[PDB]
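Consider the following assembly input.
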Amino acid sequence: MKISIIGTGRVGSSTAFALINAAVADEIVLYDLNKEMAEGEALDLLHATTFHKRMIIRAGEYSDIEGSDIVLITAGAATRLDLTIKNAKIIKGISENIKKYAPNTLIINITNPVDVMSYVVWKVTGFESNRVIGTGTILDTARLRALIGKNCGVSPMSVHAYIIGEHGDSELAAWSSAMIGGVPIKGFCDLSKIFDDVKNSAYTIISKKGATNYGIASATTALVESIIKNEGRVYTPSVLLDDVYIGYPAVINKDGVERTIDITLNDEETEKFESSKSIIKEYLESIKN
Amino acid sequence: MKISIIGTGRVGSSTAFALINAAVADEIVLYDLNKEMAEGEALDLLHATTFHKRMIIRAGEYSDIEGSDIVLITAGAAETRLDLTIKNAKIIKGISENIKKYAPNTLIINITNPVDVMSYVVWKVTGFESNRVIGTGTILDTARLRALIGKNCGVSPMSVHAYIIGEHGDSELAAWSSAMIGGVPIKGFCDLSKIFDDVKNSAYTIISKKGATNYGIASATTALVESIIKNEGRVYTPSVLLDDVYIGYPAVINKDGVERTIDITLNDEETEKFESSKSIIKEYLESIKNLL
Amino acid sequence: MKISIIGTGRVGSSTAFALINAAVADEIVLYDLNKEMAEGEALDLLHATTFHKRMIIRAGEYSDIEGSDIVLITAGAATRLDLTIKNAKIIKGISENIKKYAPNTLIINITNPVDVMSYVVWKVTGFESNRVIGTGTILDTARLRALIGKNCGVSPMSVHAYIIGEHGDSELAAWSSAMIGGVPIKGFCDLSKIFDDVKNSAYTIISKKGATNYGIASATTALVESIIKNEGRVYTPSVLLDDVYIGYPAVINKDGVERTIDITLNDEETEKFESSKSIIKEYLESIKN
Amino acid sequence: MKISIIGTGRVGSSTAFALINAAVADEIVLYDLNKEMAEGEALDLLHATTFHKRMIIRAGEYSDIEGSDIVLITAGAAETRLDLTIKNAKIIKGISENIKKYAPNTLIINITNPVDVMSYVVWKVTGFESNRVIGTGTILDTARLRALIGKNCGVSPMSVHAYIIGEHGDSELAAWSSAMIGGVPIKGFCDLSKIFDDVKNSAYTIISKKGATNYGIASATTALVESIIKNEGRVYTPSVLLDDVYIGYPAVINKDGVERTIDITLNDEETEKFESSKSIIKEYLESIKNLL
Ligand SMILES: NC(=O)c1ccc[n+]([C@@H]2O[C@H](COP(=O)([O-])OP(=O)(O)OC[C@H]3O[C@@H](n4cnc5c(N)ncnc54)[C@H](O)[C@@H]3O)[C@@H](O)[C@H]2O)c1
Ligand SMILES: NC(=O)c1ccc[n+]([C@@H]2O[C@H](COP(=O)([O-])OP(=O)(O)OC[C@H]3O[C@@H](n4cnc5c(N)ncnc54)[C@H](O)[C@@H]3O)[C@@H](O)[C@H]2O)c1
Ligand SMILES: NC(=O)c1ccc[n+]([C@@H]2O[C@H](COP(=O)([O-])OP(=O)(O)OC[C@H]3O[C@@H](n4cnc5c(N)ncnc54)[C@H](O)[C@@H]3O)[C@@H](O)[C@H]2O)c1
Ligand SMILES: NC(=O)c1ccc[n+]([C@@H]2O[C@H](COP(=O)([O-])OP(=O)(O)OC[C@H]3O[C@@H](n4cnc5c(N)ncnc54)[C@H](O)[C@@H]3O)[C@@H](O)[C@H]2O)c1
C-alpha cells in the first residue's frame, strides 16, 4: 500500500501523521514545492513510525509517486474568486503530473474550494470519475451525527443524517429523510442550531488559529481506510453528479466511488441543493479558460 | 471492571475467551456446579491473558461474584421445548436468587435458552429493574442479516438498517417494511427472503453438525458487553422488556443497560407475526408461573 | 493471507477463533477426519467473523489447503510411548498431504509430543527446516515472563528469560543468562518456584477440565502474527538444532526461522539440555520405522 | 482520565492530536498565553475526536487544570544555549508555580528544552515528589536506535536491549558495553557507531529543514503517557532524578510515575562520558539557581 501526498503543509503533514497512527500503508511519499520542508517533514514523520508500524516515509519528486495506490492533494496558495483562480492553476499542474506518473491511481482532493478543485482534477487527469473524489462534506456530516447522538443519547452509528451540497456555509442538511435507528429523527429525540454550529465552525477555527487541519486529516484518514479495507462505507465526498462535483452520498470501496445513493429531498432541500450546484457551476465556468 | 460468568460450559468458556481477547475487563470470576472444571477453565483462560491484558481469572463461589459490574448466565442444558423450558426455568430461578443475594446492584445478561422466556424469569426472580436485565435475543441473527445483505448489495453492514425481532428461533421475523440502506428503503437500493431464511435456520444446522453452537453467541455477547462497558448507546435487538414480556426488539444499550426501546413501525403482515411471537412467549410464561 | 488448520478439535477450533479475533488472515480452511464436525465448526466460526474482519471460513478437503501461506497441525488421537506411536502415524499422513498440496507453505505443528512430531513433519514433508516449526515452549516462556514481571513490578517486555528443551516437565529455564532491563535478574528483584508452577500447570489443567486449548491457541496466534507481520520476534519454538527438533530461541519472520540465537548455559543447564535432547532422540528412534 | 497541556504550540497541539488518536483520555484541557490560538486548536482537535473516542477538548485557564491526572509542559521557545536555558527557566518557574497551586496531586511530564535542566526546575519549583516529575529525556532516540539496530540485524526492536543515556542532545551516549539482542551481547549477534551518530544528529537536521521538530516527540510522549495510564511498568530513558540531577537514564514507569531507576553497568569510556554529561547539566543548574 503506497500513498503519495502532494503538498506537505499543515494539512498534508497532519494527514500523514494520522495515516501513520492508523497503520494502514506501507509507504508514504511526500511532495512539495519547498523541497527542504518536505524532507524535514518526512524525517520527523519517519521518527513517529517508530511507535506504530514499520513504514517507508520519504520526500520525493513526481516520479516517486509512480505506482501509488492513492494520491492525496493537499497543496494550496498562501477574495474567494482569487483563491479559486490561484488554486486552479496549482491543481492543473499537479493533475498533469499525476496523469503522467500515476495513471492508474485513485485521487482524493482536499485543496479548496474542494468541490470545484475536484472537478478540475477529474477533467485535467482524464480519469474515470469513480477514481477522483474530494473530501466534500465528510467532516461536517460526521460531526453532525456525533452531536445529534450526544444530544439524543444514542451512538452516532445509529444517526443517519447527511450534509450535502457545496462544502461551506451553503451546504445543507437533508433533514426530511434523516433518521435514528430507522425511525424519523423528529420522532426519536433545535436540530437547526446544531447544523448551524457545524457549518460555521470551520470559519471560527481559521479565525482563531489561522487555519484548520486536524479535523480534515482525521476525516481523510477515515475515507482512505474504507478504500484500503474495501469497506463500502457510505460517505458524502465530492463526487461527480450531473456534470459537477458536489458533496453527495456515495458508497466508497477499493475502486473508489462504487455508486451514489439517490436520496429524496423535499421542495426546500431540492431548491438549496440546486442553488448549491449553480454556485459551483459558475466557478467552473470562471476557470474554464 | 469485574465480570462473573455462571455456567462455565462451552458457551461460558468461549465467551470468557472472547472477553479476554477483547481486553475490556480487569477480573473474570467463573462459577459452575462442576467445581474442578471451572478451576481448569480458569487456569487455561488465565494462560491466554498473557497475550492480551493483565487480568484476574479465577473460579469462585457465589460470594466471589460480589461487586460484579456484569453477570453473564450461560448455564443449563441445550426433548420437547416445554420440557426444556421447565428444566431451565428451575436452574435459572436458583441462579437468580443467588445473584439477587450476592450482587444486587449488578447488570445481568442471560444466554440460557429459551432466551426470551429465561430473561423474563431472571427479571422476575431477582427483582431487578428491567433495564438491568437483558438477554441476547436476536443480536447475532440481526448482525448476520446485515452482513449478508451488505455482501449481496455491495455496501458496508454499517449502512444496512434492518432488524430481526420476536422470539429467538424459528418464530423470529425480519422487519422488512422499514429496512433501509443508507437512508433509502431497502427495496430501491439493491433475494432478501432467502437471506433471512438462511440466517434463521443456521443455528439448527450448526447444532446438527457439531452438536452445539458457541462461537457466534460468544462474539455477539462480547459486542453487547463492550457497548455497556464503553457506554456507547449502540442499538441492538436483545431480549428486552416490551410491556409485559421479554422479547427480541430494538433497544439502545449504554453503561446503565437498556436506555430505551425504539418503536419501529410494522406492516400488517409483520404485526401479525410479531403478535404470534409474543403469544408463544406469554403462554410459556403462564405455564411456568407456578415455578417463579 | 490463507491459513489452513488440520484437525478441528478443541485446539484447532479455539485457534481459529483467536485468529478471527486477531483479524490477520483473509481465509481459514478447516480440515478434519470428522467431516460434519469441521463443517459445523466452520459455520459457527464464520458467524463470529461478523464482529471482526470479513473472512472466508470453510471446511475443506486436502486440495482446499493449496496455496496456504501457513498450515497449522492440531490433530491428534483421542502411556507416553502409546501416544507418540499413535500420533506419529497421524502426522505422517498429514505431512504427505501437505507436501503434495502445499509444497511451498510454512507449517506450525502443535500435535504432541510437539518436539518429536515437528521432526516427523520436517522429515516426511522434505521441507527446509526453516519452514517447519513447532510451538515448543512458547507458552511457558511467555507465562514465566509475565509472572516474573508481576513479582518484580516490571513489564514482561523487559524480562528476558528463556525456557528451552523438551516441552513438558523436563524443560528448563536458562536462569544463568536471564535478565531484567539489561541487568542480571538476580540483581534486579524463589524464582524456581515460579518456573515449577509454570512447568506443571498444563498437567493440572488437563487434570481438571480434561484438556488444554486456550493457552496454546493464544500462543499460536502470537507466533502466526510475527510471521504474517514479518516482525522478527524472538520465540522458543520447536526448531531444528543438532539433528533434533527442540525448544530453543529463534528469530521468526515471514520466512519462518530466520536464525537461532546461541545462548550460553552454565554446566547444570547444559547437562539438562543435553538430557532433554537425548530423550527426544530416543522417541525419534522408536518411530523411525 | 484528564490531561492538561501547557503550551499549545506545534508540539503541544501535535501531542494532543496523538493522544486523541490513541484514545486513552476522557478530557484534554489546553492552556496558552495566546488565548484565541488555544481555543482554535481545541475546536479543531475536538473535530478530530469524531473518528476516535468521545472526549472533552477545551481551552482553559489554570483553574481548569484542577484534578488533572497528568500535566504536559510543552511551552517556551525552541541564540546561545545559556540564553535559552535562562529564558525557559523563567517560563518554567511560572508554569510550575501555577501547577503547584491548581493541581498539586498531578504527575508532570516536561518537554520544554533543555529538557533535563527544565525537568529539574519543575521538580524544585513545584515541590513535588521526584517520582511525579519526569522529562522526555532520550526516549525518542533510544527507540530509534533499537529500531535501526533491529532493521540492520534482522530482528524485532523488542529484542534489542540498548539504552541512550545522559544529557539529551549532542552529549548523550549509547551504553554499548551492556547492550544485548535476545539475551546475547550485541557484538556477537550482528556498524553500530554510525547508527548512533545518525540518531543523535537527526534532530538538528529536521530543525534546519522544516524549522522545528514535533511529530517524533509527540509520539514518544504519547507512548510514555500510555505506560502511565495503563500501569505497564515499561522501561524508558526519561529525564529522571539520578541522585542530584535530572538526566536521561533507564527507569520503570507505571501509574505512579517513576517506580525505580535501573542501575546499568558502564565501562570506563562510557562512565567518563556520562560524568561529562552530568557535569554539563549540573553547571547549568548552578547557573540558574538564583532564579529558582
Ligand atoms: N475541508 C477541506 O477540504 C479543507 C480543509 C482544510 C484545508 N483545506 C485546504 O487544503 C489546502 C492546504 O491547506 P494547508 O493549511 O495545509 O496550507 P499550507 O500553506 O500549510 O500548505 C500548502 C502546501 O502546498 C505547497 N504548494 C504550493 N503550491 C504547490 C504546488 N504547485 N505544487 C505542490 N505543492 C505546492 C506549499 O509549498 C505548502 O507546503 C488549502 O487549499 C486549504 O484551503 C481544505
Ligand atoms: N442464542 C442463545 O441464546 C444461545 C446460543 C447458544 C447456546 N445457548 C444456550 O446456553 C446454555 C449453555 O449452553 P452450553 O453449550 O455452554 O451447555 P454446556 O452443557 O456445555 O454448559 C452448561 C454449564 O452450565 C452448568 N450448570 C448446569 N446447571 C447449573 C446450575 N444450577 N448452576 C450453575 N451452573 C450450572 C453446567 O455444569 C455446565 O457447565 C444452553 O441453554 C444453550 O441452549 C443459547
Ligand atoms: N503445547 C502443545 O503443543 C499442545 C497443547 C495442547 C494440546 N496439544 C495437542 O494438540 C492436539 C489436539 O488436541 P485437542 O484437545 O484439540 O484434541 P481433540 O480430540 O479435541 O481434536 C483432535 C482432532 O484431530 C482429528 N483427527 C484425528 N486424526 C486425524 C487425522 N489423521 N487427520 C486429520 N484429523 C484428525 C480428530 O477428528 C479431532 O477433531 C493433541 O495432540 C494435544 O496433545 C498440544
Ligand atoms: N525532545 C524534546 O524534549 C523536545 C522536542 C521538540 C521540542 N521541544 C521543545 O518544546 C518546546 C515547545 O516547542 P514548540 O515547537 O511547540 O514551540 P512553539 O513556539 O510552537 O509553542 C510554544 C508555546 O508555548 C506558549 N508559551 C510561551 N510562554 C508561555 C508561558 N509562560 N506559559 C504558557 N505558555 C507559554 C507559547 O504561546 C506557544 O504557543 C520548546 O522548548 C522545544 O525546544 C523539546
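The longest helix of chain B spans residues 81-102. Ask yourself how this observation constrains the way the partners meet.
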